[PDB]
Design a protein around this nucleic acid. Structure first.
Ligand code: HPA
Ligand code: HPA
Lengths: 339, 339
DNA sequence: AACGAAAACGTTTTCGT
DNA sequence: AACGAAAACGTTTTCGT
């Protein structure tokens, strides 16, 4: 149970056991053996809390999430966790559900648990969270889902959501569309307002006016896609193409369409965003803007592990790049030939 | 940084600080105050590794998963994590991907981290994993995804996958079907062979022979649904209804159908399984057997927290119940009127 | 009454022999 | 050369004053 019971059992010191265990200093084979053997019978497991107490690090990462069911997220997390395992780190997942208090509760639980660093995916960053985040300015952390830098006490990865919004609108335009609608995720999120403006840029360049009857708020969830679609597709005057700010919501956009009779992309075209793992299987296969999610995760881990190991101190920010992925949900629009 | 710097700062003992911090014994207000105040300026955070070292428990749960992207799973995990937070527990997620070694690596990392208990979702349990699981027979754990009890050193929750398979076939039968096909998940999994046999029971009762050209192995992933469907729907002689052992795979079953021209449920009917969170949004809305997933998670946590707290020792097993959920992907079959 | 002294948890590492 | 003695990490708790 203890390094003692083991040392004793092996007729050696604990200092010796600790040396064989951690291969920290030369040790006679027979000794080594003897130690292992005792470790076996004893059925010993080194307490990492004991060693952590001494060594000052826990070899563990704290993930202050929002939620982990949402495909998007689920995908990043599984990414993060993989780089944790690759590099010995243990992962502690905290879905704060956009709840300040819960955020408070996790950040603390984390700090007490003394995580080597913090990976931040809160979606929304109002001042009180920004505020709270700074107390923990001491523990090394990277905020993986924001716009710019409202930080200076942090590491960040930027997703270029604007340039994705815009990639989306452009394609719709390059396909013949001009009566386009949009359902954005929450405007308090980067992946919300960010994508939206990207897209909106595109329209103004195209001089395409976007009627408010055609912009309906989503929340990244299926029911919001459904409701939003249904709302745009039920205008007396409806668009020819829709930009849905998140695939999952998009999926719920397809559901409405079909249920309302309209064919996609024959009746309406739909371009989504994220390129979730199973969008290729949406019906019809979803055309969307893809987010390098695996790389969003690893670039975060790796960006954090650095501050930790190399004890780096100057705030960093690495960009990642969204790319269009043409599937089967967008059809040429009316202006395709006039260009 | 330390209880010392704090105690000092407050002009009190550490024993006193520890008492105010943990509300463990009466303490003069002014003292209390003084302590907090020092805790504030000091910007103090109690090390839970220190306290864990002393108190003998980490107030943390180890989740030996398989994967966490898969909706099914993703859903349970988010469940587990919620009950962890409800009850103070910290969660450590370990996706072992059905990799023994990785399993070895996580189980150890976990034990060393000294988790208060283990939540087990490995999907597949070959002997070498069963074997490995027993060494850890000392730490309190519940295996949440298996058939019966190949355990005796554990707590378990059973999902009645058989009775779900069978619920599925029955409905298909009660709808007029007799040329039915099936795509099961991996036969080394409960949710695989279990559901399958449930369903197969149903057929034998109905005297419905199920042609092997109609049973195609899935792996719970979209591409397997797709491929499996495509394979069944391309028989010179095809079925009228299909039972797809997992919703995600089902989703890929719809994709093939559509892409092959066939309408669902007009051309083929499809009943899935799991009732993932967004199946209501599949197109068309997926008819499926639902797994109480949130309750599968909580019943697991709660079942574990017991062995921990109440230090219970006699192996338990609590059943959970799958229920049919009629959506819009199944249509009456040819025998509907003759019954 | 209200609080402290110091032993203790399970290890790592620095002197040493 | 090969290994041990004992200080130390940051707390909790049991005697005590
Ligand atoms: O906040 C989000 N939630 C879910 N999916 C998403 N894709 C981009 N942003 C999000
Ligand atoms: O192993 C599984 N994986 C994914 N979804 C599932 N639904 C039941 N079993 C499974």
């Amino acid at each position: 149970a203890t390094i003692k019971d083991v040392a004793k059992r092996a007729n050696v010191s604990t200092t010796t056991v600790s040396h064989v265990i951690n291969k920290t200093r030369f040790v006679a084979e027979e000794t080594r053996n003897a130690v292992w053997a005792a470790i076996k019978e004893l059925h010993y497991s080194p307490s990492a809390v004991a060693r952590s107490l001494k060594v000052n690090h826990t070899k563990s990462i704290g993930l202050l999430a929002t939620s982990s069911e949402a495909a998007y997220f689920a995908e990043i997390i599984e990414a993060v966790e993989k780089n944790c395992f690759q590099k010995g780190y243990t992962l502690i997942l905290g879905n704060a559900w956009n709840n300040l208090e819960k955020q408070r509760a996790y950040l603390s639980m984390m700090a007490q648990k003394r995580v080597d660093g913090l990976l931040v995916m809160c979606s929304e960053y109002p001042e009180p969270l920004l505020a709270m985040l700074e107390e923990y300015r001491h523990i090394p952390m990277v905020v993986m889902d924001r716009g710019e830098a409202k930080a200076d006490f942090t590491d960040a990865v930027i997703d270029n959501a604007f340039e994705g919004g815009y990639m989306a609108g452009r394609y719709l335009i390059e396909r013949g569309h001009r009566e386009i609608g949009v359902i954005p995720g929450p405007l308090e999120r980067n992946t919300g307002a960010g994508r939206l403006a990207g897209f909106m840029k595109a329209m103004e360049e195209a001089m395409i006016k976007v009627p408010e009857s055609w912009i309906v708020q989503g929340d990244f969830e299926p029911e919001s896609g459904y409701r939003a679609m249904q709302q745009i597709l039920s205008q007396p005057h409806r668009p020819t193409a829709v930009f849905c700010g998140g695939d999952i919501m998009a999926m719920g956009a397809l559901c409405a369409a079909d249920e309302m009779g309209l064919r996609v992309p024959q009746d309406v075209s739909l371009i989504g965003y994220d390129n979730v793992r199973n969008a290729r299987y949406f019906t019809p296969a979803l055309t969307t803007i893809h987010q390098p999610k695996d790389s969003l995760g690893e670039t975060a881990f790796n960006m954090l592990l650095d501050r930790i190991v190399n004890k780096r101190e100057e705030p960093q920010s690495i960009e990642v790049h969204p790319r269009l992925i043409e599937r089967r949900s967008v059809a040429d629009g009316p202006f395709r030939d006039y260009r």
